[PDB]
Design a protein around this ligand. Structure first.
Ligand SMILES: NC(=O)[C@@H]1CCCC[C@@H]1Nc1ncnc2ccsc12
Length: 167
C-alpha cells in the first residue's frame, strides 16, 4: 500500500492521473520523482522547468555541479540526484527530443531506467515539448516498465484521450 490517490489502473503496475506533477510531488513526497531532463540538465521549460521552479532553482544549482563533474548524460540515460522539497530523489531521465531529430527508438532505453526503482511518480517521457506522440510514449511505458509507475498527465484533454485510446 502506498499514498498515491485517484489514479486509474492501466495494468498490473502502471497507473495514470490528470495531475500537475509538481503539485502531485508536493502532496505525496514520493521516494522518486522523474524529471523530463535533457543531456545538459538545463531545466528551462516543460516538466523540468516546472520542477526546478518549485525547488527555488536548487535543482538547477545541483545539476550544474553534476554536469561540471561528470559531463552530459546520454540520450536514453539518467542520473539520480536530490528530490529537494518534492521527493526523496529525482531521477533525471533523457528521452529523445523529436524537435532535435533524436531517434525515437531511444524512448524504450529511457523508460528502462525506471526499472531500477520500485515505485516512481513520472511524466510521459518525450511528450510535451520533446515532441513525441504521448499515446506512443504511454505504450512504450507499459511495454517496458515493470516496476510501479504513477503517471501524471498535466493536460486534462490529453489525459482523456490517453485513457479512451488505451489498448
Ligand atoms: N503532462 C502533459 O500534459 C504535457 C504533455 C505530455 C508530456 C509533457 C507535458 N508535461 C508537463 N507536466 C507538468 N507541468 C508541465 C509544464 C509544462 S509541460 C508540463
Amino acid at each position: 500500500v502506498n499514498s498515491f490517490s485517484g489514479y486509474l489502473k492501466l495494468t498490473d503496475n502502471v497507473y495514470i492521473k490528470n495531475a500537475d506533477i509538481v503539485e502531485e510531488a508536493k502532496k505525496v513526497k514520493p521516494t522518486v520523482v522523474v524529471n523530463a531532463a535533457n543531456v545538459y540538465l538545463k531545466h528551462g521549460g516543460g516538466v523540468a522547468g516546472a520542477l526546478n521552479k518549485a525547488t527555488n532553482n536548487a535543482m538547477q544549482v545541483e545539476s550544474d555541479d553534476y554536469i561540471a563533474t561528470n559531463g552530459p548524460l546520454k540520450v536514453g540515460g539518467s542520473c539520480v540526484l536530490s528530490g529537494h522539497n518534492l521527493a526523496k530523489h529525482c531521477l533525471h531521465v533523457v528521452g529523445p527530443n523529436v524537435n532535435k531529430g533524436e531517434d525515437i527508438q531511444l524512448l524504450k532505453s529511457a523508460y528502462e531506467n525506471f526499472n531500477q526503482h520500485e515505485v516512481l511518480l513520472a511524466p510521459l517521457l518525450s511528450a510535451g515539448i520533446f515532441g513525441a506522440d504521448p499515446i506512443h510514449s504511454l505504450r512504450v511505458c507499459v511495454d517496458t516498465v515493470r516496476t510501479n509507475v504513477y503517471l501524471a498527465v498535466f493536460d486534462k484533454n490529453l489525459y482523456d484521450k490517453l485513457v479512451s485510446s488505451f489498448l
